[PDB]
Amino acid sequence: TTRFVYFVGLDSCSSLRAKVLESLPRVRGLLHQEKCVRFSNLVDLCESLAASDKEWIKDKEELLGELLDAGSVCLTLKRSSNVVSPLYFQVDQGFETLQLLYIEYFKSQPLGHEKVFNFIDKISKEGLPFVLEFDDFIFNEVVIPTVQQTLDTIIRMTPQVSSLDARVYLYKRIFLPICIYESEMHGDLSRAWLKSFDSDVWKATGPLVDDYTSTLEDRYRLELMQLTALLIKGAPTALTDMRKDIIKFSWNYIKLDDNTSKQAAYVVTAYFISRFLTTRIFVALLRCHQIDTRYLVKQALELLAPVLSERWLKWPRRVLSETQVANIYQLIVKFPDLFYPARDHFIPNIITAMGKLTVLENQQLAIDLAELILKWETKLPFAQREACVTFLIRYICISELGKRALNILYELLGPVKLQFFERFLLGYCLNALEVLAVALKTWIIENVSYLQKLLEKCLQDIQEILQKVLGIILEAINKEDEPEEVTNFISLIVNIIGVAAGVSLCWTLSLYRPNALDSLLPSIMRTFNKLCRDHIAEFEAKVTTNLLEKILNLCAADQRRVFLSLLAQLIDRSVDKDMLLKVINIVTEWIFTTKEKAGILGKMMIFDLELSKKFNQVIVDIFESKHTELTARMETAFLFGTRLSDVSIRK
């Protein structure tokens, strides 16, 4: 029979296909006579016919219903789990191929009653709708007055008794995407499905909601909650009768015994209150909870707090009067931090509670609580600022999260204990960052004064943090002398060393003052570090080379000997971008040691066979502005630049 299916599929046997079409009623007769008659064979005939002729399936709805019934009974036969393998795949291929036939027949005409008839039939079949084709059809349906009337039909025939819980869940799983997608472009979702929804759902589900049992229709309950919430978000409910119906609806689902659905009911009630007596709901929602319930209660609290002001913070404070639940309270006091001035007395108590609780998820909660305490202390009125600075300094010492804590500590200390944190590798780096940030901004001055100890002793990365702290403190003081001395010592150490710690020290010294050892071009140590960088071309040496020291060492003239050594090393070593730039700058300043300039020119010429192009452009500028060995090497450079490929310099 499968060979017969293929033969019918081929276009050559058109007469045979027509003869088979003549016998369309007869072939189903043998099926009505499972094991004896293969459903898969007849369905395979069906897809061969459908592929051959597109008009074939337009009038096979009775045939499709008979095939659905046959598939249902065959599946019930194949659901036995006694012997190892009575389930044979041919019925399965029949199932998904019948699904494809249904997809094609649904593409034939846009009416949506046949899909829900299929859903009604599919209550007993274990096989779910085909993942690709059926979901593509659903998406096409989702992607207008016809949409509204289809939704109206969907809602009007929704409560059919023949539907079962799983198929109802799939039915709602398909109903939601059209609602949300239209909500993406919606103005108010008032474009007549809700008209029948008025009477067909909340009044109809009265016996269902009054069950007071936690069973499988919790899916129905949760989807009703979600749909009502979406409708409220759209807000087309001008009339108040449906509003009263929905508030009674929410109260009744509050009355259900199942917990998670109950916090879902509170979430729906919070949405209803936000859209437009609530103190009891608030105080009940402040009660303890677990993970699956904490997510719901915290979402309800977040959506309920902003609208509770006009409908107040004494009750949560009283609740705190009598952990994970404590973390939830920290969240629900951190969010209304903007509302903290309204409850003036709550701000100091909340700040104290946050400070007490602060001293993974736990670390994030502690950081959030510390930030909330700092913000509440700042916005409460001083003594609060000092307390916030001390708490943030302690948090930073305990602990980029450390950089954020340091910034928070500096902000709190802006407007005494910060000096102790500044007083002498994650903890050391955090302390150095806090000292630097506080110096940049009562406690701020003490931390700036004590940042010298942090710079000298942070307690490689810790040393870099301490050097950066010294540089930042010196720059802020420039706008005490101890931060400047610490920065100068760090610069001297980095320049003498000639890895990232030295580069950070050089950058901090350059930022603090141009007169630092690394910053100052005439300084011998910085030029020696540049020479060390050029020899191998050790991040301190690279920072010194990139700084103004290497470029302006030639103009300083000491730095002259170190610059000559740098030029000799660069000529001896391979050409590198930083080394070539330093050599070019040194030569330009020398023209405006002679042997060092000659060596730099020779190194550039060797690098020629874009850096040499830039050096030759500088040479062009010099000649526009315009010792025998220097003259000879200038001869060589001039002729080599003439030989170069670039048109501009040659011309």
Partner: protein, 552 residues
Amino acid sequence: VVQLDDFATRLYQSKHSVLSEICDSLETYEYFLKSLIPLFIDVVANSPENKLRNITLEILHRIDALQAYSNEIVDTLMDLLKVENELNGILCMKAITTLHKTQEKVHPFIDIVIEIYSNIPQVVEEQFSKQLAQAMFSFKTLAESPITMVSLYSSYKELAASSLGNNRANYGEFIIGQVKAASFLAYLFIRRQAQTFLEPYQQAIPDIIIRLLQDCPSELSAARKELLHATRHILSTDFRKMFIPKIDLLFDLRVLIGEGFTAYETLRPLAYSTVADFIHNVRDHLTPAQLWKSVSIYCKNLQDDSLALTVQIMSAKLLLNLIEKIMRSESKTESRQLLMVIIDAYTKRFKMLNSRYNGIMMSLQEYLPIQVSVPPEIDLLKDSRYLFKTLMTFLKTIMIGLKNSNPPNWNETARGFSNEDINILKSLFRECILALRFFTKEEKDLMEIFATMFIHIDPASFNEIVREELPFMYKQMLDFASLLHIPQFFLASVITSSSFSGILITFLKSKLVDLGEVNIIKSNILIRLFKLCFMSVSLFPAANESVILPHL
């Protein structure tokens, strides 16, 4: 001094004094505890006297006289455990247990806890309170805390209470007592691995656990989670793992009873992990019908997209675990049907993965108003890559096992397939090559795994698959050139080279007509295919000379 502050705080009104003392304790040694006792002395749950006593107990728990307070707490716990009334001593029992952990009367405290646990069955029998059962569980924990030898007597009392356990107020009390008995059984299971069980019947505790699972309502989600924890502690003991299968006939009873949505959410991952470990241990003794039930339920779980990546991947791990039991038995045609279902499930998973390719580079569920769980933040592309790589690794061994299960010279070579087998293999090829589009060395290794898993297939079925799907081969190389490696790996092996040369050469001869007018990239792919076919004869001249001679 704290004692001075307490004395200052001390210096109808009883409730107000208790509230003020509690507030002072919240705001703020032996002397401090010493001053607290007169304050409590100076100062039916709703009853004002009971409320004041509870407030004093809470204050004592928050914070010589400490020994007297501990003795009073022990007496209150003993009274609460023995009798339904005066059950408000849970805080006192917790404070006494905390004091025992850290003052030298730990052994008398453990003895009192054991006495309370032994009197708990009498209280339960008389009632048939719930707080009495909770106090019994707390006493069992407090007795397990020290290294005292009374642990054996405490365990015997707990076992007796569990055996005894196995109106709305009555229903709630029974549920809470069942939860407390579940906690006690979990403690007993934790202590069971250390030494041989002294209970008269080893399987009696698993039977009690199963009965409690049946009895526990869906409302008590925490109780069912604790029962799940007890079940995962069951897997530690091997003898109990041997005893369970004769009792756990149904692997799905725990899920059917969990009709609540809370259970419907929490049960799947952890409970399926418990059964995963259990089946890993007891695959030898599984009934073939039970083997089908397990493989089918885990196929459905893998099929369901509501589950997380971990659940699907561990289901796949158990699937490759069960192919061992599949091939250990006789290589009958009926046995291979389960493996065919396995590969069909894998293909369906690949189909669902491929359906979301364009979306990654329905999934519109982020905008629902009420989310019942924290939304995942895992990157879709990285998750797809990891899932596909691990599933490919699983299919490597799955296909090796399929090769080592040839049905009736047939066993050695030329395994026989039915039409459905060719259909499902062509599907697997379809979605696998479609998934390779997710896009180096890792992709080359994946293609090598693919080549290894399809070279060992029967040459006739392999030839049919290649002949049917090579147009899709070409359609895919037209997009990404990295797929050119699969024909190279096919021609590299001597087994598949002789056929693949013929199929590829006839397809290229068919498509030679349009090679001219087509653009540069597509023509380049075509010439690369021709070049690969031409080195195919160079690599293995003996088998390729005859096939490539006529077309030249």
